[PDB]
Amino acid sequence: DEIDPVYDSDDTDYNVPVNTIGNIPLSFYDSYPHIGYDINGKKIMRPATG
Amino acid sequence: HFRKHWQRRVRCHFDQPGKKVTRRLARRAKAAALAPRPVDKLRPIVRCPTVKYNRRTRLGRGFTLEELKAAGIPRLLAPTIGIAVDHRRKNLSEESLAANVQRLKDYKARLILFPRK
Amino acid sequence: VYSEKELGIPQLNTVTPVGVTKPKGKKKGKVFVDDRESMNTILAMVEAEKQGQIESKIMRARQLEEIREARRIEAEKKEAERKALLEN
Amino acid sequence: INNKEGLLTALRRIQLDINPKTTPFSFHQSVVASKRTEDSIPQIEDDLQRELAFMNQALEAARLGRSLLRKEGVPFTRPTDYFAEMVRTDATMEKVKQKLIEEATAKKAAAE
Amino acid sequence: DRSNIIAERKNKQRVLVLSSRGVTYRHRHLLNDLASMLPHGRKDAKFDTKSRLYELCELAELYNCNNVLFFEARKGKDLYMWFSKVPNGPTVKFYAQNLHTMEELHFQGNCLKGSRPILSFDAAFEQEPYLKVIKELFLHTFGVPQGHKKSKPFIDHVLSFSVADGKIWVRNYEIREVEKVKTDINLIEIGPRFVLTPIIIQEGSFGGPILYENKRFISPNKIRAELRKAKAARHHARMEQQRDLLARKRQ
Amino acid sequence: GALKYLEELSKKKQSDVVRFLLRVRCWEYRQLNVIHRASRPSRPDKARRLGYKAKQGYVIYRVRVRRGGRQLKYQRSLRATAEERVGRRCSNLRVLNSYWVNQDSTYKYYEVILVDPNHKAIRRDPRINWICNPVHKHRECRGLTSTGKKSRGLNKGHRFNKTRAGRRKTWKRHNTLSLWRYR
Amino acid sequence: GHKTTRRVLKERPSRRKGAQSKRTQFVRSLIREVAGLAPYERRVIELLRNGKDKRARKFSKKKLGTFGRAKRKCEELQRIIAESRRAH
RNA sequence: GAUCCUGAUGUAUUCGGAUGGAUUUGAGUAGGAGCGUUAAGCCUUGGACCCGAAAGAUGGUGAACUAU
RNA sequence: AAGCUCCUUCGACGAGUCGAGUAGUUUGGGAAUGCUGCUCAAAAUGGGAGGUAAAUUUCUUCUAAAGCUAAAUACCGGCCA
RNA sequence: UUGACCUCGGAUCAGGUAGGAGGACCCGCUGAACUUAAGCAUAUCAAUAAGCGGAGGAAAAGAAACCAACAGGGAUUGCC
């Protein structure tokens, strides 16, 4: 029986971020209206201001 | 190549003749203790391990149990009559077994054993 | 101490992107900054870099937010220019 | 020992469909050159020519990939605003640009 | 959906990057570089040499991986890479040498961590039947599926496999874009540089009948044994010469 | 058979029975002194295989030792430190060998088997008259116990080239310049 | 190499060092029953009873450090489960 | 010996270098010279032809402050 | 009391120790060269170390976590010569 | 009420034992710097000197979880 390559619940990467940004600091994007880019190539807006 | 202190670690062998005389007198003293007996124990003939030296034989540590049995010398009596015994060495070859049994038989033929007390 | 502009040092790709590099000894397209929104964002950057460390967290947040808003308004200004020149 | 029939049987077992009429380049992103690089590398020991041929093969692959990928409409260029983790660390490239600095300075210092 | 893939057609490929016990620091650096370039992968530590090559397959089933990239080091000196599709076939063994890993400060190139690469292959890879099986597996290993949620959105590097000698040479390059003169692509080496020579292709996960044998593989252990035999040969020649000299002196 | 039953029960340490017993004892030993005498070995099978007998001349001492490091790491173990402290306390006895008993989170605990060399039974019995011999004074101080041998690397093989037969002796032998009469 | 007549050697008890002592096995099983289970073994037992067998095996690796040790621990605990089931 | 070729019977169907060559290279072959030691000279390292700089470190002995 | 021989009988071998992760230190020696601390923590046709591309991880060689032991070796101190 | 067992104490109870000196060589812990070289830094000096603990006439090590790939060797130690 052949392997089905899924990511089960215990997998470290079961839940992955949508930011598609690695382990870099968030010191970047600090002067920019957005935070990171999604996998489809679209930049991600900051939600709002508090 | 003198970055270290060879002066505080240097050795001179001016006692070479003195140590030689000491060793010769030590061999004389063990001959005085073991008077009729030789001052060495019988050693087997073995083959050198490395392929560099595998065509020459030398003297091993002691005789193996099965070759001792084949020659007919009891294990508990061999170190008594002056034959070294090595329980770690194994024959693995009829050639070595036969050569060592020949050596032990030559010792048997040349040996003089005194009847206890 | 010598300048990396004087030395023929190639640009290296780090977390900050190199982007489309421009060839050496050639005409690099001069981009003219003339929109009041663009001077707004440049001036906001200059004022932030001059003022520097503000103790208050909300003050830091507000200067950063005005920088982001200047960048945004510049973005819709450029998008509107693009649409105007693409349909009309 | 080279069993072509068995090798092809094993290929047919695993061969994911890459036919261009049905499978997009955005899906495979693999392109094969139309020229053997061993025919452009006369001597294997010639490091400069060997690396040049490898680079040329990769350049052809990159240009064809860009053409197909732009036709299919997926982003190719990395925006100057996109900061992300890189395979080689920032300290590593600081060291690399440093060594480039000492090399250039040594050369122009010898000239001076 | 647990595939972590957002795409119209799902290419579910999961890679298990495994190390053996006797690997060196350079081998571990190569493994780390490959794992960093592979986002659909899982790094896994030393594997028991007394264990089973199909216990590799159960381990991959444990981690739900359909491809295995296994590093097996011999004498702490030589690398061997087993590429496999687990569970049913096929699997190749390469002798890995000539390693130049990353963090070697002479490459000058970089790429995003996990971005989809461009796979460059060779006309020999399409001509020879076994090179065709090795191309497919290397595609399945370095595929970096289209909709995977750990991959980067932009493309900036090309991984090129070339066949010049009876070996496979792998290079990794950054695509730098330069504005044309009144854009053009330039390539700068970014990553690992190692040479693979094929040894066997087995039908079956880590076993089964042999489908291809190099029959021209010169083992580094064969070179070492040749050196040892040469030393012994000179020693024995000297002994024979001494015997002949003594014999002629007698005569 | 009780000795193998105890050996297996000691092998299974995080088992419920052993964990409960170790907790209560760890409490009892914290209430007791840093170094104190034992009566009977809490691990009789370990003591017996290390060489403890129920003769007039064998004693046990339990010692508490603080755990951790000096980022510097002490080359001697906490086991060797316990043996040395027990010897300094009972200077009239020879430290035969020590074994682990409890660990908590602040201190490790060790029972040290010691032998009286001046006792008549010990002197008359062989197998221990060697420790009656004077060359074995403060084996724990000279590193001649099992912990000392382990720390000194007194093993045979290509992995122990620099430490077997004495590390300092090997260094001296390698760093002496030997000059003969005929050079 | 050289041609020597091979000899067959007697069985080595040091080679028989591998433990086949049925009495040692009996002692080990009885001690397992008497002492019980460690907390991590209890977690593995819970996972194996619930059916998370691949998770159990991964946790056994994380707690022990080797694939073979994890496999042996999982087999031992599965045998304990089977013996408990047939005993109840 | 090495490099670039030229390409023979054939061979396991993929294994090899024979002939003729080259503005090539050897610390090459081309009918062995080395080993040991004495004396003198030179080079390097050790204190290094002799005398002489401030410093740093390890371990000890003592006191000096309307500061109380 | 002891040695051998034979067998339709048996044959027990060292655990907070291996080992995994990690920090320091050390070595010619990240198959971590050894050692120490710290978190986890084993096995019984077992375990350790090597050999090997040869097709699977075959083969080779030893039994760790208990202990004793003269000699060949060192010696600027002790009794002397 | 009595008497055992276990644990912990007292005695100028009977009998012993440790300290300190020495430390040339020996076994451990701890541990520098001067110097040399190198764009810089690791390194070298040195796993040395100083400091601390512990033995003897020798000490230590020592009877393979060794070496090896052999046609095998066979505790440890020292010289070439």
From Swiss-Prot, chain A:
Taxonomic path: Eukaryota, Fungi, Dikarya, Ascomycota, Pezizomycotina
Organism: Chaetomium thermophilum (strain DSM 1495 / CBS 144.50 / IMI 039719)
Protein's UniProt name: Ribosome biogenesis protein ERB1
Family according to the record: Belongs to the WD repeat BOP1/ERB1 family.
Segment of the intact protein contained: 152 to 201 of 801
Organism superkingdom: Eukaryota
Subunit structure: Component of the NOP7 complex, composed of ERB1, NOP7 and YTM1. The complex is held together by ERB1, which interacts with NOP7 via its N-terminal domain and with YTM1 via a high-affinity interaction between the seven-bladed beta-propeller domains of the 2 proteins. The NOP7 complex associates with the 66S pre-ribosome.
Subcellular location: Nucleus, Nucleolus; Nucleus, Nucleoplasm
Reported function: Component of the NOP7 complex, which is required for maturation of the 25S and 5.8S ribosomal RNAs and formation of the 60S ribosome.
